[PDB]
Amino acid sequence: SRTVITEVIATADSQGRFLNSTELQAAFGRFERAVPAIEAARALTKNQDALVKGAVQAVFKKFPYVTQPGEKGYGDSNQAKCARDIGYYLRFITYSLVASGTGPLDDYVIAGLREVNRAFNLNPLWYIEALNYIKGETGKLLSGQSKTEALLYIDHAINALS
Amino acid sequence: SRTVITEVIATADSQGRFLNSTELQAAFGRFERAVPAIEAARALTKNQDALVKGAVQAVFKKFPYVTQPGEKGYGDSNQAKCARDIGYYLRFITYSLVASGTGPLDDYVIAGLREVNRAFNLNPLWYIEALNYIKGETGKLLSGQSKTEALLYIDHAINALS
Amino acid sequence: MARRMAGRPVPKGNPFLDMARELTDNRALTLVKEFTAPSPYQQTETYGQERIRALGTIEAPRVTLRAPFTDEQFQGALYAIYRHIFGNTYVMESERPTTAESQLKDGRITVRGFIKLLAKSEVYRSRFFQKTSQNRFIELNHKLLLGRAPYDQAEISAHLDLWNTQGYDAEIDSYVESEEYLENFGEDVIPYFRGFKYQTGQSAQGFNRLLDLYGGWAGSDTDRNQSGQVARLTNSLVRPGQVVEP
Amino acid sequence: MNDVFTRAIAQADLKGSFLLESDLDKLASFAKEGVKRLDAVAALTNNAPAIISDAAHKLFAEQQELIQPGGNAYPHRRMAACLRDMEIILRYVSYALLAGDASVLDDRCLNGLRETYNALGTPTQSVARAVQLMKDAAMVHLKSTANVTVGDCSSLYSEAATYFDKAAASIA
Amino acid sequence: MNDVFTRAIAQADLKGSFLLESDLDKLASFAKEGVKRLDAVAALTNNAPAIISDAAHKLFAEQQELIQPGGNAYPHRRMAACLRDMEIILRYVSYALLAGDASVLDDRCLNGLRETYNALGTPTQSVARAVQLMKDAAMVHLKSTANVTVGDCSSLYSEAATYFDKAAASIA
Amino acid sequence: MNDVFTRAIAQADLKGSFLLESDLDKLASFAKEGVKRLDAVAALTNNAPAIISDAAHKLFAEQQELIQPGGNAYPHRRMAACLRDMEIILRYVSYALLAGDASVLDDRCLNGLRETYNALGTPTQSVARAVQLMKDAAMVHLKSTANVTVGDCSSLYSEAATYFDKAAASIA
Ligand SMILES: CCC1=C(C)/C(=C/C2=NC(=C\c3[nH]c(/C=C4\NC(=O)[C@H](C)[C@H]4CC)c(C)c3CCC(=O)O)/C(CCC(=O)O)=C2C)NC1=O
Ligand SMILES: CCC1=C(C)/C(=C/C2=NC(=C\c3[nH]c(/C=C4\NC(=O)[C@H](C)[C@H]4CC)c(C)c3CCC(=O)O)/C(CCC(=O)O)=C2C)NC1=O
Ligand SMILES: CCC1=C(C)/C(=C/C2=NC(=C\c3[nH]c(/C=C4\NC(=O)[C@H](C)[C@H]4CC)c(C)c3CCC(=O)O)/C(CCC(=O)O)=C2C)NC1=O
Ligand SMILES: CCC1=C(C)/C(=C/C2=NC(=C\c3[nH]c(/C=C4\NC(=O)[C@H](C)[C@H]4CC)c(C)c3CCC(=O)O)/C(CCC(=O)O)=C2C)NC1=O
Ligand SMILES: CCC1=C(C)/C(=C/C2=NC(=C\c3[nH]c(/C=C4\NC(=O)[C@H](C)[C@H]4CC)c(C)c3CCC(=O)O)/C(CCC(=O)O)=C2C)NC1=O
Ligand SMILES: CCC1=C(C)/C(=C/C2=NC(=C\c3[nH]c(/C=C4\NC(=O)[C@H](C)[C@H]4CC)c(C)c3CCC(=O)O)/C(CCC(=O)O)=C2C)NC1=O
Ligand SMILES: CCC1=C(C)/C(=C/C2=NC(=C\c3[nH]c(/C=C4\NC(=O)[C@H](C)[C@H]4CC)c(C)c3CCC(=O)O)/C(CCC(=O)O)=C2C)NC1=O
Ligand SMILES: CCC1=C(C)/C(=C/C2=NC(=C\c3[nH]c(/C=C4\NC(=O)[C@H](C)[C@H]4CC)c(C)c3CCC(=O)O)/C(CCC(=O)O)=C2C)NC1=O
Ligand SMILES: CCC1=C(C)/C(=C/C2=NC(=C\c3[nH]c(/C=C4\NC(=O)[C@H](C)[C@H]4CC)c(C)c3CCC(=O)O)/C(CCC(=O)O)=C2C)NC1=O
Ligand SMILES: CCC1=C(C)/C(=C/C2=NC(=C\c3[nH]c(/C=C4\NC(=O)[C@H](C)[C@H]4CC)c(C)c3CCC(=O)O)/C(CCC(=O)O)=C2C)NC1=O
């Protein structure tokens, strides 16, 4: 994981000198914006089921064929693991919000995304529409700066999917 | 490109030596089945329009939604552009047959394939279906060795799409 | 009566009739015809590389040497190394080091360590250091040990000061032990001209500078010229864009 | 490279004096209104694939010359190079937008593009047209009041426009 | 680098077409004389030291100033360089003879040779004379009906000759 | 890395004698069966993506902890590496099938794979079961009598089964 302070220690240990003004300043700013990130993560922690089921129904309604027989969206276990995948995306966005760094995201989802989507025939369009729906509900649930910081890690996940 | 001849020349040059018996034996094998390859190229060139049109219809048949309005496949522009893409793929399969190697495919289609597809939101599965259709028809068109060599280049393209 | 059954009369003399015939008659087939037409500036798959001198160097396969090798890929890797590191300069049989090759064959040193030994060898000095200014030495070090041209003047300043303070061995170590060599080539890949394809972080100029350094597949970093291995990128580095006359 | 603080500092040092209270005011205003700059830079970064997709679509629709066989963007490898160049240039405009000075762009980015593309034979005119298309496809992402606090940012729009114009005019 | 097949493929592609039937007839022919081509290449390869030695002997008997002190083949270093250049040129000629296309010569062998020899002060006249002597020596081994089932192969002699002239004209 | 012909060559050198007619007959038999061997390796390479996806589905069906958090394959890149390593072992098994020698896989990687999978803490029996499922899915594809002239290939199936068995046992 590469969080802001983790970036600080990493970019420091490579060279000789200690943590100068710039690194202390970056850690400082992260330490302010962390607490709003914590409350945003809490607000996002109350609504697992609503977010996941809304996103699932949104991606199903955008793609009518996956539901239809003969397609990989068909199935009880398939839809259950759809829900588990969206829960995974939600929890890893939560982890990123808590850490104030894209470390958990890059570690747990984005690393090896392409190859596995290749081998298991998953389409990133489904997950990208799910993330857009989650963006939509974060628009209403969260307000102001908390909304901004949540949306920034979210659309980072979009940028990773695309 | 990476023919048999060209790959041999490169591997002998990188070692800064002349062509020894192994290289000339490989070149002899290449020249020896140049005839089945050229015959398969001649067939796949003669039966051009039938192959392209059947492949396009197979893409639509397996992908109903693509023809539906308001999205990617609808519009005679996209229709003609699909036909152009399949003509490209078949052209490079016959180029590979003639060049007794995957030079032309790798140079034109295979290298840079996935970034360009993801940039234009083109689905690999469409092209995989078109090449499966071409595989089925060239099974009928060709018999003996030409059949096998063609099929080798088709599934090489299919694998690169996969 | 049948002609009138066609429909109400349409006034004649419309200047858009030819446009209608093109937009109506067999649009898909015609569109394929214009889509697949040749482009009046004809460029092959490798028109750009052939327009540069450097196609033979891009098409050249990457050569690697992992520890369990038998005989012949070793004899080829030695040729590739002595061709690249020494810059296509002839290395007579006496100059070729036997101890370093024995070390490499045993496996006590990786290919990167062997590159380091050859860079500290007397051939590399006598060709690139001893007969050339420091600018030309830094250019050659970048081109030979990194496959790229220098990106800016701060590289020259830093490496000149590193040499002036720590010596030739430290100067060479800054190239081979650098993170860039390790990420690009690592322990077991022979260096190659990678600056022809966009390398992450390069300036716009690095491509032009590598073209200026290359001099073709036949050419070399000889120093036996009538000139004496002058530096090529002296003004392209500190005046990257402009040109000045004395 | 140089942001605006470093640039003003260099101009002060060349005259060999402290920074005037006027330039202190300019830099204070820049720092106060750099939050809007952060927003604009984020708008370019999150929406980069969309901008490149739109610019590519309109460029190759406008010019069949690039994608026809024998064209300069045809062989499906030169095509990835085209999209990569668009990525690089939009990246560098985002850098020069966050910084505040075109030094990042015209130093780290575009001293050598004209003659690089001339050495590769590619049309530089089409590259300038691609950059203009990127500009047009980017401003629409850049003005969006969706999920961003409402305010006036016309100066930042002019700044992004002049960075895109500089890149296009240099490449051309 | 291009063999004859890849050259014809590129020509077809620039026209945006499949390969015509005359082109496939020609390539089928080229693959039908491939065995004779292989014998020619193997006669160049086996007799390489003999050709180099014959050409060197005749070149230095002819041009004696190359080996006087001060000439541009005097010490052992630049004599070994002579022999190395000649061996390389025969190597690339045999490469192009196998491929059937002179693209390897321009791509690699003759990419900067004129510049190297003008920089070094090497007399390009003498290098071209070496290549011509090499051609004369090689044809003797090419036309050797011994150990190969007799037939007509004058096309291959013409091809090898024109490769040698290509290299000689590029250098000189 | 070594093939069966060079095994005969090496043992002949070790005993110091010329190759015996018995081993020479064995090598002739192998060389004529090489036509079927080429189709076997071609089937493997052709069906490799389908085979690996199939075996991944069967494995993730039979073994589930690789899904749950804390399981080895739960982090996304880790099961990406699962698929990649499955592909690598299939590629090496295709190499071995073409060569006819099992050491090209074993001596190449299995020495370090044992200690690597011991240190990493992965369930190595799961990797052995992955090799077994790989073998089964490849066996399904190798018996495809369509597209190929019908012949006798029981020995090739036995060879593939034993190669995969040895690979798994070295893993196990
Ligand atoms: C580390 C975090 C992580 C991610 C991101 C992940 C993606 C993922 N989803 C999978 C299964 C799946 N996932 C889906 C869900 C998609 N398909 C439908 O169309 C939906 C619209 C859409 C949901 C948004 C489906 C249908 C499968 C079935 C494929 C199978 O049989 O495994 C699989 C195959 C293995 C398995 O989970 O059993 C992976 C690797 N897995 C992970 O462990
Ligand atoms: C070297 C060989 C080569 C290939 C393979 C290639 C693929 C290719 N297809 C393209 C367009 C396209 N290709 C398709 C896909 C087809 N349309 C649908 O009818 C089908 C379902 C589907 C095929 C099965 C579509 C829909 C577009 C237009 C996409 C857009 O305009 O955004 C484009 C963008 C150029 C343009 O805008 O016209 C490329 C680069 N280009 C090449 O030079
Ligand atoms: C640091 C000083 C140093 C030492 C000590 C050294 C010895 C040495 N001998 C080697 C191989 C060898 N060494 C020998 C010599 C022995 N075998 C015969 O029976 C002889 C009786 C006897 C010699 C007195 C032989 C025959 C080999 C070849 C083995 C092989 O190629 O695998 C190797 C590995 C391959 C290579 O050198 O390329 C080393 C490192 N080299 C060094 O640079
Ligand atoms: C190994 C032999 C060798 C030498 C010595 C050499 C000189 C040299 N001087 C340089 C800069 C410089 N040289 C000077 C010296 C001048 N300033 C004043 O006017 C003085 C009159 C005068 C010195 C007596 C200065 C001030 C710089 C820095 C200019 C800059 O950073 O732009 C640089 C490039 C950048 C740097 O070093 O930071 C070189 C390469 N080049 C070589 O290859
Ligand atoms: C860091 C700053 C930087 C930039 C911007 C940069 C651009 C750049 N683009 C290149 C290739 C290319 N770029 C293009 C794109 C052009 N062709 C069409 O006209 C399009 C309209 C147009 C895109 C706007 C093409 C086609 C090539 C390949 C040329 C060839 O292979 O012949 C190359 C040569 C390396 C390669 O072949 O991959 C460079 C150096 N390099 C840099 O270091
Ligand atoms: C982590 C990265 C990060 C970002 C991106 C960021 C943006 C940011 N934008 C803000 C408000 C603002 N944002 C803008 C920019 C808007 N003006 C126009 O409406 C456009 C839609 C758009 C720019 C073209 C403006 C004008 C304000 C209010 C400041 C003012 O007018 O006084 C604020 C102050 C409190 C808030 O409303 O959130 C922040 C912190 N802060 C961060 O820490
Ligand atoms: C594409 C493959 C390739 C070629 C063709 C090639 C030519 C070549 N010949 C060289 C030297 C030379 N080449 C010659 C050749 C001629 N001089 C004449 O008198 C004779 C006809 C003949 C004498 C043997 C000589 C004499 C030298 C030595 C020049 C010197 O060291 O001063 C050099 C470099 C000089 C140095 O080591 O610094 C090159 C690059 N190099 C290559 O990598
Ligand atoms: C291991 C590498 C390898 C080599 C070297 C090879 C050469 C080769 N030469 C052949 C015959 C031949 N070879 C030649 C060429 C020779 N005739 C002379 O007059 C010329 C001096 C000379 C041309 C330079 C000719 C004319 C034939 C008779 C068959 C034909 O014309 O195609 C044949 C066909 C068998 C036969 O009809 O005897 C082969 C396969 N094949 C290989 O797999
Ligand atoms: C080219 C030859 C080669 C092989 C074969 C090889 C095996 C190998 N697999 C690894 C990672 C891994 N390999 C696996 C796969 C296993 N885990 C279970 O889920 C599956 C039953 C099973 C799939 C076959 C996993 C999950 C990891 C991740 C462990 C980690 O990253 O910490 C690693 C650690 C470093 C790395 O290479 O990424 C090695 C050395 N390495 C090589 O260089
Ligand atoms: C282009 C690359 C290439 C391949 C692939 C190749 C293999 C190859 N397989 C052949 C037939 C054959 N192919 C097979 C193998 C199949 N038979 C079935 O029973 C098995 C399920 C299956 C094994 C995978 C067999 C057994 C023969 C006939 C040979 C015999 O008499 O046993 C033939 C001769 C055609 C004929 O007999 O009419 C060749 C050249 N050679 C090549 O140059």
Chain A residues whose CB is inside 8 A of the B125 CB are 121
The CA distances from residue C119 to C95, C130, C200, C228, in Å, are 13, 13, 25, 20
Interatomic CA distance for residues B115 and B121, integer angstroms = 10
Distance from the alpha carbon of residue C240 to the mean position of ligand 4, in angstroms: 18
Nearest Cα neighbor of B80 from C26, C38, C32 is C32
The CA distances from residue B159 to A47, B129, C211, F50, in Å, are 42, 12, 36, 9
Cα torsion through D74, D77, D79, D85, rounded to 10: -140
Contacts of C204 (CB under 8 A, 6+ apart): D108, D109, D110, D111, D112, D113, D116
Transcribe C38-64 into DSSP letters.
PPSS---TTHHHHHSSTTHHHHSPP-B
Structure tokens at C118: 């050859």
B80 and C28 within 8 Å at the Cβ level: the answer is: yes
> Do B94 and B11 meet the contact criterion of CB atoms below 8 Å apart?
no
> Do B37 and B98 meet the contact criterion of CB atoms below 8 Å apart?
yes
List the single residue in B65, B123, B125 with the smallest CB-CB distance to A65. B65
Q: Which residue's C-alpha comes closest to atom 12 of ligand 10?
A: F149
Contacts of D126 (CB under 8 A, 6+ apart): D59, D63, D65, D66, D72
C189 in helix, strand or coil? Answer: strand
Residue in chain D lying closest to C42 (CA): D70
Is residue E37 packed enough to be buried (19+ CB in 10 Å), middle (13-18) or exposed (0-12)? Answer: buried
Interatomic CA distance for residues D10 and D8, integer angstroms = 5
CB of A73 shorter than 6 A to ligand 1? yes
In D33-147, where does DSSP find H-type helix? 34-46, 48-62, 64-67, 78-99, 103, 113-119, 124-142
Location of structure tokens 């803490």: F121
A119 and F81 within 8 Å at the Cβ level: the answer is: no
CA D17 to chain centre: 33
> Do E7 and E103 meet the contact criterion of CB atoms below 8 Å apart?
yes
What are C64's strand-pairing partners?
C189
F49 and B159 within 8 Å at the Cβ level: the answer is: yes
Is residue C25 packed enough to be buried (19+ CB in 10 Å), middle (13-18) or exposed (0-12)? Answer: exposed
> Do E60 and E67 meet the contact criterion of CB atoms below 8 Å apart?
yes
Contacts of C193 (CB under 8 A, 6+ apart): C54, C57, C58, C143, C147, C210, C214
Among positive and negative, which fits the CA dihedral B98, B103, B107, B113?
Answer: positive
Residue F134: nearest ligand to its CA?
9
Q: Which residue's C-alpha comes closest to atom 16 of ligand 1?
A: A82
Is residue A117 packed enough to be buried (19+ CB in 10 Å), middle (13-18) or exposed (0-12)? Answer: middle
**How many residues are there in chain D?**
172
The CA distances from residue C81 to B14, B18, C112, C157, C183, in Å, are 10, 19, 11, 28, 19
Cα torsion through F96, F97, F101, F102, rounded to 10: 60
Interatomic CA distance for residues D132 and D135, integer angstroms = 5
Structure tokens at E69: 């002190």
What is the maximum span of chain B, computed from C-alpha positions, in angstroms?
Answer: 61
Chain B residues whose CB is inside 8 A of the F147 CB are 139, 147-148, 151
> Do B13 and B6 meet the contact criterion of CB atoms below 8 Å apart?
no
The CA-based angle D73-C151-C112, given to 5 degrees, is 95
Contacts of B42 (CB under 8 A, 6+ apart): E21, E24
Residue A112: nearest ligand to its CA?
1
CB of E145 shorter than 6 A to ligand 8? yes
CA atoms within 13 A on the CB side of E118: 8
For residue C82, give the H/E element and its range. Answer: helix C72-84
Cα torsion through F84, F88, F91, F97, rounded to 10: -140
The CA distances from residue F15 to F10, F87, F142, in Å, are 9, 39, 38
Residue C153: nearest ligand to its CA?
4
CB of B130 shorter than 6 A to ligand 2? yes
> Do E107 and E167 meet the contact criterion of CB atoms below 8 Å apart?
no
For residue E167, give the H/E element and its range. Answer: helix E154-171
For residue F52, give the H/E element and its range. Answer: helix F21-62
**Residue F145 neighbours by CB distance under 10 Å:** 9
Distance from the alpha carbon of residue B115 to the mean position of ligand 9, in angstroms: 26
> Do F43 and F142 meet the contact criterion of CB atoms below 8 Å apart?
yes
Query: What method did the depositors use to determine the structure?
Result: cryo-EM
Secondary structure letter of residue C91 according to DSSP: -
The CA distances from residue C69 to B23, C74, C104, in Å, are 21, 7, 10
CB of E80 shorter than 6 A to ligand 8? no
> Do F110 and F168 meet the contact criterion of CB atoms below 8 Å apart?
no
Interatomic CA distance for residues B101 and B119, integer angstroms = 29
Interatomic CA distance for residues C176 and C181, integer angstroms = 6
**Residue A157 neighbours by CB distance under 10 Å:** 23
What are C189's strand-pairing partners?
C64
Distance from the alpha carbon of residue B17 to the mean position of ligand 7, in angstroms: 18
E94 and B99 within 8 Å at the Cβ level: the answer is: no
List the single residue in B15, B80, B108 with the smallest CB-CB distance to C32. B80
Contacts of C155 (CB under 8 A, 6+ apart): C138, C142
Render the burial of D57-94: b for 16+ CB within 10 Å, e for the rest. Answer: ebbbeebebbbbbbbbbbbbbbbbbbbebbbbbbebbb
Chain B residues whose CB is inside 8 A of the E13 CB are 91, 95, 104, 108
Residue C54: nearest ligand to its CA?
5
**Residue C95 neighbours by CB distance under 10 Å:** 16
E114 in helix, strand or coil? Answer: helix
Nearest Cα neighbor of D147 from A129, A101, A137, A86 is A137
D120 in helix, strand or coil? Answer: coil
List the single residue in C39, C205, C211 with the smallest CB-CB distance to D69. C39
Interatomic CA distance for residues C34 and C23, integer angstroms = 13
CB of E8 shorter than 6 A to ligand 7? no
List the single residue in C37, C218, C224 with the smallest CB-CB distance to E112. C218
Atom of ligand 7 nearest to the CA of E80: 24
B139 and F147 within 8 Å at the Cβ level: the answer is: yes
Among positive and negative, which fits the CA dihedral A8, A13, A15, A21?
Answer: positive
Structure tokens at B78: 């996209």
> Do D84 and C198 meet the contact criterion of CB atoms below 8 Å apart?
yes
**Residue C14 neighbours by CB distance under 10 Å:** 10
Nearest Cα neighbor of A104 from A91, A87, A117 is A91
Interatomic CA distance for residues E142 and E137, integer angstroms = 9
Q: What is the resolution of this structure in A?
A: 3.1
In chain C, the DSSP E strands lie at none
C148 in helix, strand or coil? Answer: coil
Nearest Cα neighbor of C87 from C31, C42, C133, C127 is C127
Interatomic CA distance for residues F172 and C31, integer angstroms = 60
Distance from the alpha carbon of residue C124 to the mean position of ligand 3, in angstroms: 27
Nearest Cα neighbor of C134 from C157, C117, C150 is C157
> Can you give the C-alpha Rg of chain F in angstroms?
18
Residue F96 phi/psi, 5° resolution? -60, -40
Structure tokens at F15: 């005993």
Chain C residues whose CB is inside 8 A of the B15 CB are 72, 75-76, 79-80
Interatomic CA distance for residues A51 and A68, integer angstroms = 23
Gap from C70 CA to chain F (nearest CA, Å): 9
CB of C88 shorter than 6 A to ligand 7? yes
F66 interfaces chain A, CB cutoff of 8 Å: no
CB of E130 shorter than 6 A to ligand 7? yes
B10 and C61 within 8 Å at the Cβ level: the answer is: yes
E111 and C45 within 8 Å at the Cβ level: the answer is: no
Interatomic CA distance for residues F45 and F163, integer angstroms = 16
